[PDB]
Design a protein around this nucleic acid. Structure first.
Lengths: 225, 216, 109, 128, 4, 124
RNA sequence: AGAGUGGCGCGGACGCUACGCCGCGACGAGUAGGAGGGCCGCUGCGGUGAGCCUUGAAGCCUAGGGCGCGGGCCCGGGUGGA
RNA sequence: ACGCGUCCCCCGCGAGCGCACGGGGUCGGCGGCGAUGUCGGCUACCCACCCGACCCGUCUUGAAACACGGACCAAGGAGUCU
């Protein structure tokens, strides 16, 4: 009894730790390998345009995959097609937003609600601040917080999205488990804009705010998150 | 045994080190320094000798009682806190005491104690203010700095020696502390062109003369 | 031998046209006329000084008429010199257009 | 020598005043006691900006401070010296109140007992 | 075993 | 069982006293005096109690015999303990612990046999 | 956190009216009208409180002190007289 | 990337001390004012000033209405048995 069993009780503890230190190095080597991508993809869009402009050519840059969308009109008095389409994007209240992958079925949804939203093509800084500061989960039918790496590894896991680093790749590059890792997220919780709106009612193009902005949605995020 | 060395990465920013942990493998000499694997008392009495116990159980329990707290993260007491200063305050600059029975008075700075309070020293003579403490926050600093490099400032005058007792009376201990700490100070204030009509007089506000504008 | 505080004048509550807020005041500090100017005054102690019928005891004096409400300057307000405040005792509206003292003590010079 | 409780937190409250009934301020035949206005026309039913207000549950006392008097105990009302003994093991949270219509002589016999037993009585000196 |  | 008749008593006995959002129990051998399923003083097959002794001096203790649970004039069994406050409590902790006689009550009968003496001791 | 056949010191908070405690999230307008809960009231009958009262019951009055969001209720004083 | 015992393309229990941006706050920090004139008391009585606030029931698409019942106070007063 015991003197045997206590030493065997000092062999199982060092096993569950060694399950962490073989996993603790992999969180570093996954993050240092995505850093290689974000200089090898960044400078390979400046590579082609010089070497076209060289030979009197042109270079059209890559048309988008991914787009953030924010609900700016309220909740009172609303037409019954639009209530259905704003539901499907999970924008159920004012100043709330979501990730949305793009195709023909995804844009023609976003022409029916195109005076209740603002959307645009986000960057490596407007993907991560949102996912770092604000980003919550949806585990056990609850919006419980992410101050850990055994919530994202524990729910999804089988898709190979374990730490906070793979939620940047799979969204910022729309990869081959995106759906689950974006219905993973509860939609975002932005406060109001600090500076403000130009004119909420109208389309960007006229003067105000509504409809798409291709490269100045980056201005209504660092003001709102 | 082999006495304790100083840390072998210089501090780069609070929290962060400098040399990374394979190159720092080098500097703790890791490669070459491997290894592998009270209660009671028995006193004499007047055949027999007793067994006494140290800490016996109590004879009154109370009827209801509180339970243990959750431990806070990083809450040290005053003693261990860290002390700061300001840019304008340096040793020998000129301070304006703004609060006690002396208020508006021009008072000299000597040395910050380890309770964090100052030593605002009037040259008792001129103002009417001796060795005293005052508190960073309630003291304006001023642009004037006659140097206090070369004189002597005493040790035994430490922060508890000031701390209060109970017609408090000036005993014969604080009279060689009074005139000897100040007669080293007094040959460097009168030598400047016309400075001992200004420490004596009091500052105050009038009009056209607004706190937010002027430099002092 | 003189004054050690800066003169100012309680000039209404924080409010918009038809609902007034009573936990924030609105001082007009003397001779200060933009925002730029109003960093100094921020955080700095302030006092409304007055005089009831009976005797209140003091600290550092005899038991006499004079009392205070104590407070605190918080942030700037508007474009033009003004400032917000937050006393522990919510102010009378008698004091609208009457004196208050901002001090110099918790200084940052 | 007053009795400390076990522990004494910060009592904080949400209102102070009572809730008075609409138009008790005109017809003496209308009693202070509150009633829900069930009108049509009505102003207080609809919450215009000005009038009386209404009881809600957002006027909650918080569970750690409900039934806690200033001294810090909570009442438990009594008639005789046997109903006292009850409290003894729970001295530090609860405090006896000798009842109104209880007599002048039997009231003296009690306050002696809640001395031997450390129990705190809110109405000691009384009938005299 | 590899580090002892 | 015990577990039965609780369901019967719980909210009904002639020993139950409610009011002011509180709730108490005035049963012979309830030590904490509260309507509960640990603390009731008749139901079960074994019982502890701590009563204030005959005259002023001392404390009296009450076990319940395992046998005849249907024979009440010879069911409880009594003893008096009139000794020093730390040493008197040697006995009571040596009744609950080393008999194995119902090991829940331990820390109730240490706070009841120390606010029966803090009485009979003379007042402030 | 498995079980076998062979090679000095008698000591360690609270709990669990399980019809109770405790544990982590999202929401909270409402007239006609539904439904639950009321340790909210008013009068009578069986049980119970080794209840209480001429050393002062009920009712009233009270710029006395306390309790719950709320309906309402607890205590100081004076009257009154079963 | 850092002991060694063997598999290879390709040429399973070391020893302790210590500091902290680490699973929701604590000073192992201080100072005045205290007996017949002052301390405190949100609650309930009178006054004063700034903001807001038209009279209730009611039928009615619409009521502060130039739509009707209401001078004041008590005591009674309307979904019930079979």
């Amino acid at each position: 009894n015991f003197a045997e069993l206590k030493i065997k009780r000092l062999r199982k503890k060092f096993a569950q730790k060694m399950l962490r230190k073989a996993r603790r190095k992999l969180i570093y080597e996954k993050a240092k390998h995505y850093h290689k991508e974000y200089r090898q993809m960044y400078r390979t869009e400046i590579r082609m345009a010089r070497m076209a402009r060289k030979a009197g050519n042109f270079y059209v840059p890559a048309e988008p995959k991914l787009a953030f969308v924010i609900r700016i009109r309220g909740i009172n008095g609303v037409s019954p097609k639009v209530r259905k389409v704003l539901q499907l994007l999970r924008l159920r209240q004012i100043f709330n937003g979501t990730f949305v992958k793009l195709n023909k079925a995804s844009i023609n949804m976003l022409r029916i609600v195109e005076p209740y939203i603002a959307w645009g093509y986000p960057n490596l800084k407007s993907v991560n601040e949102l996912i770092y500061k604000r980003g919550y989960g949806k585990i056990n039918k609850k919006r419980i917080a992410l101050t850990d790496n055994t919530l994202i590894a524990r729910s999804l896991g089988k898709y190979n999205i374990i730490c906070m680093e793979d939620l940047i790749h799979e969204i910022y590059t729309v990869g081959k488990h995106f759906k689950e890792a974006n219905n993973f997220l509860w939609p975002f919780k932005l406060s109001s804009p600090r500076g403000g709106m130009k004119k909420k009612t109208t389309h960007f193009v006229e003067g105000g705010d509504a409809g798409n902005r291709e490269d100045q949605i980056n201005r209504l995020i660092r003001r709102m998150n | 045994k082999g006495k304790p060395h100083c840390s072998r990465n210089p501090v780069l920013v609070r929290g962060i080190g400098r040399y990374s942990r394979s190159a720092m493998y080098s500097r703790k000499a890791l490669y070459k320094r491997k290894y592998a694997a009270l209660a009671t008392v028995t006193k004499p009495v007047g055949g027999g000798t007793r067994v006494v116990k140290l800490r016996k159980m109590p004879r009154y329990y109370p009827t209801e009682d509180v339970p243990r707290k959750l431990l806070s993260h990083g809450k040290k007491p005053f003693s261990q806190h860290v002390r700061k200063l300001r840019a304008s305050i340096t040793p020998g600059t000129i301070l304006i005491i703004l609060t006690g029975r002396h208020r508006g008075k021009r008072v000299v700075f000597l040395k910050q104690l380890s309770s964090g309070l100052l030593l605002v020293t009037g040259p008792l003579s001129l103002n009417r203010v001796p060795l005293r403490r005052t508190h960073q926050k309630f003291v304006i600093a001023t642009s004037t700095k006659i140097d206090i490099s070369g004189v002597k400032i005493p040790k035994h005058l430490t922060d508890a020696y000031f701390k209060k007792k109970k017609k408090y009376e000036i005993t014969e201990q604080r009279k060689v502390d009074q005139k000897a700490v100040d007669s080293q100070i007094l040959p460097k204030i009168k030598a400047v062109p016309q400075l001992q009509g200004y420490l004596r007089s009091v500052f105050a506000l009038t009009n056209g003369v607004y706190p937010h504008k002027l430099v002092f | 031998s003189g004054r050690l505080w800066c003169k100012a004048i309680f000039a209404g509550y924080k409010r918009g046209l038809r609902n007034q807020r009573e936990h924030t005041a609105l001082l007009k500090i003397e001779g200060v006329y933009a925002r730029d100017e109003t960093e100094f005054y921020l955080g700095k102690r302030c006092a409304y000084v007055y005089k009831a019928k009976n005797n209140t005891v003091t600290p550092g004096g005899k038991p006499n008429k004079t009392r205070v409400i104590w407070g605190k300057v918080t942030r700037a307000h508007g474009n033009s010199g003004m400032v917000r405040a937050k006393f522990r005792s919510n102010l009378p509206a008698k004091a609208i257009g009457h004196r208050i003292r901002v001090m110099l003590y918790p200084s940052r010079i | 020598a007053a009795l400390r409780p076990l522990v004494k937190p910060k009592i904080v409250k949400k209102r102070t005043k009572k809730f008075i009934r609409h138009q008790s301020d005109r017809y003496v035949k209308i009693k202070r006691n509150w009633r829900k206005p069930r009108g049509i026309d009505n102003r207080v039913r609809r919450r215009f900006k000005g009038q009386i207000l209404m009881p809600n549950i957002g006027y909650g006392s918080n569970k750690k401070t409900k039934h806690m008097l200033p001294s810090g105990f909570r009442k438990f009302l009594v008639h005789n010296v046997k109903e006292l003994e009850v409290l003894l093991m729970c001295n530090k949270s609860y405090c006896a109140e000798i009842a109104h219509n209880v007599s002048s002589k039997n009231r003296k016999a009690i306050v002696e007992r809640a001395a031997q037993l450390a129990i705190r009585v809110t109405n000691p000196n009384a009938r005299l | 075993r590899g580090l002892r | 069982s015990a577990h039965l008749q609780w369901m019967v008593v719980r909210n009904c006995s002639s020993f139950l006293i409610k009011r002011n959002k509180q709730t108490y129990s005035t049963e012979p051998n309830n030590l904490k005096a509260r309507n509960s399923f640990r603390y009731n003083g008749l139901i079960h097959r074994k019982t502890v109690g701590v009563e204030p002794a005959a005259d002023g001096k001392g404390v009296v203790v009450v076990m319940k015999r395992r046998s005849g649970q249907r024979k009440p004039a010879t069911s409880y069994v009594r003893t008096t303990i009139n000794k020093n406050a730390r040493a008197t409590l040697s006995s009571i902790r040596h009744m609950i612990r080393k008999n194995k006689y119902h090991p829940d009550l331990r820390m109730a009968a240490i706070r009841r046999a120390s606010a029966i003496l803090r009485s009979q001791k003379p007042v402030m």
